[PDB]
């Protein structure tokens, strides 16, 4: 009817207002602001340790707080927890559902998370037992596949699902406290800002939304990507974040200008992006591609900081330790590689 | 100390050995078109999974389904739900990460189709072109059945599915169409014969033989 018509007209007017407001705040560009800085040059990183022992393709990974232990999720149905320094196993968790699309490590180092094409977030506690791994709580309130999950401190966990909605979960009560609605496609990746107060979420609608944990309403929407966003990571400062996409691009979005600050792409790249993550100082943006490698991009100069070779299959997960000592990447070749 | 960590890692790897044995023994299968189903046939593990509990957005959870032996694609031979199955099959065949997966195509609801085609209810010729220019193939097995009109349409849908299969997928793709709708318990057997050929053709290529 005509009611939807003038409502869409008002929405278009508001979009034009947001666009011209963004344009009015574009006095400079990251390229010329950074131009005077010394180029980082070629950075060489070599495989320190290869972590073998998984069966199927590894889909997600997450470092621990102490930069010692990482958890790996594979579609074989395992949640093997690694020890990077001495390349052994700490725990091996068999999953009720064979397909897992995400895993999280609690900052307290007491709980682990998984989830996938089962619409349930399973929480496994690694401390209270006499030595075992048991499902402490199963969070079933999602109508789509879980794509990413992150603990807040020890009891609140935010989950991104294919149900077009994110959600905040209270583990102890096993209830969905707040829901995050407003996306259009399936939500793939969410990144928590340091000193957790608000988180981002990039979905298949080529848009990343910034959500407030307490308020529950998204603050700003960043629509600059051509295609689906497969990964997103917060810049260490907390006023910026970088988003991967299937458009063969990584774009750094600032929080205080609501704009894309720099485009990280090359004409020799056609494949999409699987996972992105910043370094300790935010100088290097590491990005895993479908070109079988994990290109390293300088976060200010938009230049190839160094080509990072590796797995014989597609990389899907890529993470950096909190102390920034090493970078761990996991691929579909059932292998985790540690680089420094 | 390090001794305890080494012992724990050794025990975990020992368990992972049996896990590898079971995982290699079990063959996974996707049911697409219409959550878990394990069935035993000739003493080999088989695992069926239907993922109908997710939304119609299919492009990004199907990326997670590429180690399966085959994708079993069931269609209704009766909106035009036929081309929707055709377009879905095109996406499966041509996908980058599904490029090494064979399809065990099942043309279900043949009896519903057969009851439909006995009069001009919804003419396929007026619904799909190049029907009046298509006849039953010589290398066919119509068998004793209904009016030879239905088997002409019966084989036309299979032929159209196959033109997609033979247009790409040099050696990692093979389509295995079947004509089945009635519950007779040999359908699962038809899957066993299909999955045997999939692994057999996989090994023939892997040894640079086929």
């Amino acid at each position, epitope marked *: 009817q005509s009611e939807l018509d003038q409502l869409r007209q008002e929405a278009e007017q508001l979009k034009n207002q947001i666009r011209d407001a963004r344009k009015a705040c574009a006095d400079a560009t990251l390229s010329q602001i950074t131009n005077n800085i010394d180029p980082v040059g070629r950075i060489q990183m070599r495989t320190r340790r290869t972590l073998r022992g998984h069966l199927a393709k590894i889909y997600a990974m997450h470092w621990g707080t102490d930069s010692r232990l990482l958890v790996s999720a594979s579609q074989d149905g395992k949640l093997i927890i690694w020890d990077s320094y001495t390349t052994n196993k700490v725990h091996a968790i068999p999953l009720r559902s064979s397909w897992v699309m995400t895993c999280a490590y609690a900052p307290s180092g007491n709980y682990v998370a998984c989830g996938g094409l089962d619409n349930i977030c399973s929480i496994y506690n690694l401390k209270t037992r006499e030595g075992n791994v048991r499902v402490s709580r199963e969070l079933a309130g999602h109508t789509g596949y879980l794509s990413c999950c992150r603990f807040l401190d020890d009891n609140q966990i935010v989950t991104s699902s294919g149900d077009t909605t994110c959600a905040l979960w209270d583990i102890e009560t096993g209830q969905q406290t707040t829901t995050f609605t407003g996306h259009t496609g399936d939500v793939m990746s969410l990144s928590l800002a340091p000193d957790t107060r608000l988180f981002v979420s990039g979905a298949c609608d080529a848009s990343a939304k910034l959500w407030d944990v307490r308020e529950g309403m998204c603050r700003q929407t960043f629509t600059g990507h051509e295609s689906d966003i497969n990964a997103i990571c917060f810049f260490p400062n907390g006023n910026a974040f970088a988003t991967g996409s299937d458009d063969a691009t990584c774009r750094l979005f600032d929080l205080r200008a609501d704009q894309e600050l720099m485009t990280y792409s090359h004409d020799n790249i056609i494949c999409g992006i699987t996972s992105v993550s910043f370094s300790k100082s935010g100088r290097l943006l590491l990005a895993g591609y479908d070109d079988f490698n994990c290109n390293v991009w300088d976060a200010l100069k938009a230049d190839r900081a160094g080509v990072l070779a590796g797995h014989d299959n597609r990389v899907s997960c890529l993470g950096v330790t909190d102390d920034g000592m090493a970078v761990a990447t996991g691929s579909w070749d059932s292998f985790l590689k540690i680089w420094n | 100390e390090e001794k305890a960590q080494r012992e724990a890692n050794k025990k975990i790897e020992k368990q992972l050995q049996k896990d590898k044995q079971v995982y290699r023994a079990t063959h996974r299968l996707l049911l697409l078109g219409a959550f878990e189903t394990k069935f035993q046939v000739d003493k080999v593990n088989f695992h069926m999974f239907d993922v109908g509990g997710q939304r119609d957005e299919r*492009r990004k959870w199907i990326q997670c389904f590429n180690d399966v032996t085959a994708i079993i694609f069931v269609v209704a031979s009766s909106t035009n739900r036929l081309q929707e199955a055709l377009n879905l099959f095109k996406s499966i065949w*041509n996908n980058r990460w599904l490029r090494t997966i064979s399809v065990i195509l099942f043309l279900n609801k043949q009896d519903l189709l057969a009851e439909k085609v006995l009069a001009g209810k919804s003419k396929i010729e007026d619904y799909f072109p190049e029907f009046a220019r298509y006849t039953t193939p010589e290398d066919a097995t119509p068998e004793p059945g209904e009016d030879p009109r239905v088997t002409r349409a019966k084989y036309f849908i299979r032929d159209e599915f196959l033109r997609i299969s033979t247009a790409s997928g040099d050696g990692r793709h093979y389509c295995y169409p079947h004509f089945t709708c009635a519950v007779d318990t040999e359908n699962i057997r038809r899957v066993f014969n299909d999955c045997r050929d999939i692994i057999q053709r996989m090994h023939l290529r892997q040894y640079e033989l086929l």
Partner: nanobody
Amino acid sequence: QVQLQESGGGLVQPGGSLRLSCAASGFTFSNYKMNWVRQAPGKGLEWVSDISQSGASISYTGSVKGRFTISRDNAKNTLYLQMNSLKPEDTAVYYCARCPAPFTRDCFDVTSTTYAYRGQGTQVTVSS
């Protein structure tokens, strides 16, 4: 954004000719396969036709083959698909939609809404 504004349509007597033009913005046109999806009242979304990046690989729905033709102008970032000899059964809300991934030969587009890479469409009615 990825806005895809569609034009044309309206009320056309059966057997006539009518043209749709869909404008593309926010993405590189040459990198994406594009296709039209229609939705008759009550009925669900049905794929009409698709065209490759270079305009070579072109296919149509059987019910519309021989009547509709699809062509794209990469320089102008517009997609055209023509009516010829319209029938009362083709009244629908035609949409212009984009393949989700760039430089890909497979698409998963037709969905019960919740698909961002598709415009709001233009209503076409053939009643006379």
